[PDB]
Curated annotation (Swiss-Prot), chain B:
Native source organism of the sequence: Influenza C virus (strain C/Johannesburg/1/1966)
A GO cellular component entry from the record: host cell nucleus
GO molecular function, one term: RNA binding
InterPro entries in UniProt: Flu_PB2_2nd, Flu_PB2_6th, Flu_PB2_C, Flu_PB2_CAP-bd, Flu_PB2_middle, Flu_PB2_N, INV_PB2, PB2_helical
Listed name of the protein: Polymerase basic protein 2
Leader sequence residues: none
Designated gene of the protein: PB2
GO BP field: 7-methylguanosine mRNA capping; cap snatching; DNA-templated transcription; symbiont-mediated suppression of host gene expression; symbiont-mediated suppression of host mRNA transcription via inhibition of RNA polymerase II activity; viral RNA genome replication
Pfam families assigned: Flu_PB2_1st, Flu_PB2_2nd, Flu_PB2_3rd, Flu_PB2_4th, Flu_PB2_5th, Flu_PB2_6th, Flu_PB2_7th
Location in the cell: Virion; Host nucleus
Keyword tags: Cap snatching, Eukaryotic host gene expression shutoff by virus, Eukaryotic host transcription shutoff by virus, Host gene expression shutoff by virus, Host nucleus, Host-virus interaction, Inhibition of host RNA polymerase II by virus, mRNA capping, mRNA processing, Viral transcription, Virion
Record's function text: Plays an essential role in transcription initiation and cap-stealing mechanism, in which cellular capped pre-mRNAs are used to generate primers for viral transcription. Recognizes and binds a wide range of cap structures of target pre-RNAs which are subsequently cleaved after 10-13 nucleotides by the viral protein PA. Plays a role in the initiation of the viral genome replication and modulates the activity of the ribonucleoprotein (RNP) complex.
Similarity remark: Belongs to the influenza viruses PB2 family.
From Swiss-Prot, chain C:
High-level lineage: Viruses, Riboviria, Orthornavirae, Negarnaviricota, Polyploviricotina
Domain RdRp catalytic: 250-446
Purpose: RNA-dependent RNA polymerase which is responsible for replication and transcription of virus RNA segments. The transcription of viral mRNAs occurs by a unique mechanism called cap-snatching. 5' methylated caps of cellular mRNAs are cleaved after 10-13 nucleotides by PA. In turn, these short capped RNAs are used as primers by PB1 for transcription of viral mRNAs. During virus replication, PB1 initiates RNA synthesis and copy vRNA into complementary RNA (cRNA) which in turn serves as a template for the production of more vRNAs.
Main location: host cell
Coiled coil stretches, renumbered: none
Name of encoding gene: PB1
UniProt protein name: RNA-directed RNA polymerase catalytic subunit
Signal sequence interval, chain numbering: none
Post-translational modification: Phosphorylated by host PRKCA.
GO cellular component, one term: host cell nucleus
Native species: Influenza C virus (strain C/Johannesburg/1/1966)
Cell wall biogenesis/degradation found in the keyword field: no
Family, similarity comment: Belongs to the influenza viruses polymerase PB1 family.
Top-level class of the enzyme under EC nomenclature: transferase
Amino acid sequence: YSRVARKLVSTQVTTGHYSLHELIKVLPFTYFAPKQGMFEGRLFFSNDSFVEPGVNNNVFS
Amino acid sequence: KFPIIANKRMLEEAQIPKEHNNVALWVLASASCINYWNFCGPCVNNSEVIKEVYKSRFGRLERRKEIMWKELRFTLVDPERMELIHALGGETWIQEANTAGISNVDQRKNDIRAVCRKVCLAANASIMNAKSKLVEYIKSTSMRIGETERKLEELILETDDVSPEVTLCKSALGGQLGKTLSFGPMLLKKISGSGVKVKDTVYIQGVRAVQFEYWSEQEEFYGEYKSATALFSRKERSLEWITIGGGINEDRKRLLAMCMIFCRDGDYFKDAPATITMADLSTKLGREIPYQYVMMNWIQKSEDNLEALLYSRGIVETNPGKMGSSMGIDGSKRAIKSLRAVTIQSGKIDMPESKEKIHLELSDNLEAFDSSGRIVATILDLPSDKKVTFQDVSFQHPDLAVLRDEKTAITKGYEALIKRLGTGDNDIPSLIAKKDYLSLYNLPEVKLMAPLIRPNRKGVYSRVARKLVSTQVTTGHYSLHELIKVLPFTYFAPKQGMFEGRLFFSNDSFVEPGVNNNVFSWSKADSSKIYCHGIAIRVPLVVGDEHMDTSLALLEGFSVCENDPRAPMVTRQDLIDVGFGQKVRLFVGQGSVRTFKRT
Amino acid sequence: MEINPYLMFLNNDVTSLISTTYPYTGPPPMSHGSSTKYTLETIKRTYDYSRTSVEKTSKVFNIPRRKFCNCLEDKDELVKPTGNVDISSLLGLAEMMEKRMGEGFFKHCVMEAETEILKMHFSRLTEGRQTYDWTSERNMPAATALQLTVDAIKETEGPFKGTTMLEYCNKMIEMLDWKEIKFKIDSIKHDEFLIRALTINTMAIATPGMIVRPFSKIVETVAQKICEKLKESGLPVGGNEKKAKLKTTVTSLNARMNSDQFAVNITGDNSKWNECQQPEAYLALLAYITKDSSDLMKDLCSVAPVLFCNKFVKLGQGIRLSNKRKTKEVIIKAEKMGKYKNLMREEYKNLFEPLEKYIQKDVCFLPGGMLMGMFNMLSTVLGVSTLCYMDEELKAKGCFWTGLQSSDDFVLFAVASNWSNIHWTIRRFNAVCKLIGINMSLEKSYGSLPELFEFTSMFFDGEFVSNLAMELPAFTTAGVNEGVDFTAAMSIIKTNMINNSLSPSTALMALRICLQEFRATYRVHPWDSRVKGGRMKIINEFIKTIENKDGLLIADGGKLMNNISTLHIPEEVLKFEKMDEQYRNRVFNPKNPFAVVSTHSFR
């Protein structure tokens, strides 16, 4: 998850065309080190509650 | 709520408590009360009284159980049974189920004619060794005909049943004939006249041309089709007159069309339909075909072709006094308008008999000749190859039967996997107890079964199977059944992808772990058996606990746990994003749910 | 692209695809409301099809009585339906039919019907679709109104101890003369009770009371005993026997005529078969029938006819009023529509004034016609009489006819040797039919060469006889028990298979559908299913106590074991030896608080 988050951030930051409502959502995952794996599309916490980068859900809308 | 009425003393004497488990049951009462009464209530022994009272119904059941079910057949029309006529015979179909009578002769005739057709077809695979391969097939084919284990070199002769196949196979034996002919499924015979062969041409698409042969003289014959007699005379590529005595629409139509082709009457022997130009293939895979059989095949495709052929034959308006003996386009007995040179009547035309036996000569294409040409039979007048199960038969010479199918291939692969066990070193249990699973991924049997695997996504199947195998071996918890089920996939290399829950072969079939299926099924209390399309197979060993541990044969990186409804239902995909100590429910089949926990 | 579902009729037959044209059998959602408008139109068309204007005031009601029989007038425009019957021609046709069949034919049939009736119990009348109560003034099953009538007889003039049809009929007769009659409490006078007994309600299929019921049953029994000996009578039964009759007729025809003739078939559909059948002709016919027999039957058969010659018809729900904006809406009954005629629209007015004469309080004194689906056997007999006609005018021309006739549908077979004499024969037949009210439609009756025709949805052809009378059960409307409704459905499917209206795969699909309908009706499911319903709760716990799951009953988390060859066999008989002895004896325990006698009944 960290990899994906950092990726998105750079893409938004390098240009200037960013959405402030997505960084505030994905930042908490960028603390760890990137790795390799298949990103299904969701970002889970430790309590079986996730947020999705681009669509609103009960946890972040 | 309690619409159903009841008795009162009958209730207390049976001690039926209300709201047993929050179900009132009740003077009045509910319906569940009946359930509670038949599941926990008084016990009687009155079976004999019930049977005696309902003797008629139970005797009907007994009679039903006293049946020997037979085959069924599609066809038309040319007390103890009244209780079942509904299920015995309709109008398009019928079942020959019998009660006490037995006589196995006509079924034997059907079997022998079918196998003769089969063998004569099998001989149609070369261009030079026709007669040789044919006779060798015959000599290499034995049968448990009826009750006697006889060979197929004397039945063809001892029997007396005219047919294209009987004759086509007996001519090679120098056997006697009956002067009968066979132009397709129809049966013909000569009455008078004679002629000689003559050639003529016919166009296709209006540009090309092809040669056919016929007779120029006058000659009368006796045609015959299913439930249809006839008589006619052919003269100079055209039909002069004809009469019929068997009244049916389809039978008469087809018989007339076949006799017309036999007389080559009509303009479609000058030019051809626009349908033939679609092919122009008067040829087999590597052989030639005449024009008559091509036309016939064009008839078999649709009845519109038959109607077109019949329109080619002149249609006119019937005159008085002839309606009774006229015909119609649809086989109608009488009509204001009919066809030229036709005559309908009642009563089947008595067929003549020829008491003169002869012998013919086979050709490269197996066509038999008695004299002055006059082909009597051939393969062209046969149906297409139709696979049919043969029993009471022995066929030894190669080409006897392919006997190779994906199903049988899988069956043999699994038989080999089972036998490999062999209760010895360098076999399944020794490698298991040794925890050497990698060698399992290199055995010969998996290599033989590999071609039966779906190639496009075999890597993921192998990955998953290699996961299950290792996770069940290392820990020591396993089940030989599911292992053997998934082993054939642990040959190729693993790869990344999306798995769904099924392992697909190349024949569009599939297999699934933790469940049973026609191709592979098993159950406890009979673990020494393994069904394959219902075929029970045996295990060379015995086990009482090696199978009881299937906690790891359902999923890859999970293990079953105690049931818990609070746990949320999930799919096979989101599993990747689960953690530890996190139970999850999931379907393991049809309406079969189970709880799982990682590791 | 354009999907035209109909292009499959070109290169195929019609006997194989016609079924796709009509929806599947069942209770239709159309639900037409019999109300004042339709009934009045019916009565008007009835009085109109009577081509006369004569009348005769009665003495029991002081009301006119349009006598539309043997008084034909207004010959103009005879194409349309007619109802004036001629007795001479009727009796002549009856005599022809008698001569053909035999002399002691009617006598034998009436004797059989009599003897059959003698040993009959009046309780049989409880077997009926529905009736009309003469006390509550409503529609109900036969048993309810029968109990009402008997208990009213008890309350008023003591019980009825006959326990037989004849005593019941004589008791009704006597009651026709009683001046006062009681019932739970209130009583009534002679005239009112008479009216009520001669009342009818529209369900506009009729729904008569109970007084006339037994006489109608007797007449129908006689007509049935008669229709059996008739070759051209497909009413009493259908299917296998019907096809046998068809083919027998066709073969006899083919073997009868010569090579010079050419035949033709006709698909006919009698129109207004209920608004042109008169009970007066039926009475004269029954008289001619019983002419030589016990006077008992002579008088008996003459009861229902006269009871139908005087039949008051209950007008449906009255009209309603309303203001412009529709904020207010008044409701009035039928008896008072003659009080506000000045308000109703013209079309509703012109349909009401000419009939006000025949109204008494709220009904219309219909002096004839035949609205009920009754006397169908008798109408069929009359049709067969029509078909058995032959004279010398035809013989001279070398022509004749024959065919088959249902209640209001028939099939004709004409014979001739010219493409014109056929028309003359058809016109002769239509004339003889109209002479006695039997008419025919023109927008729904066609004809063609002998090969193709239709009869009672059985589309006959040169071959491939196709049926379309696929019936089915219905649990929600008729709920009885959890041990009978499945066996009855199996028997029904078996029957449908016999009549060739069903095929093996079709029967299996219908079976697997009716099983699910049954389960959903009684709110039951198997054990494998993960259901949480009430009845399942206990079944979800007392199930592990058994092993013979196959022997379990459908009503108790069971599974099917019957099939095509095991329909006549109930599932019980099929699972007896298989049910765990415990469950078995627990079901067949006659010492319980409650065809095969199970412990599954819903009294």
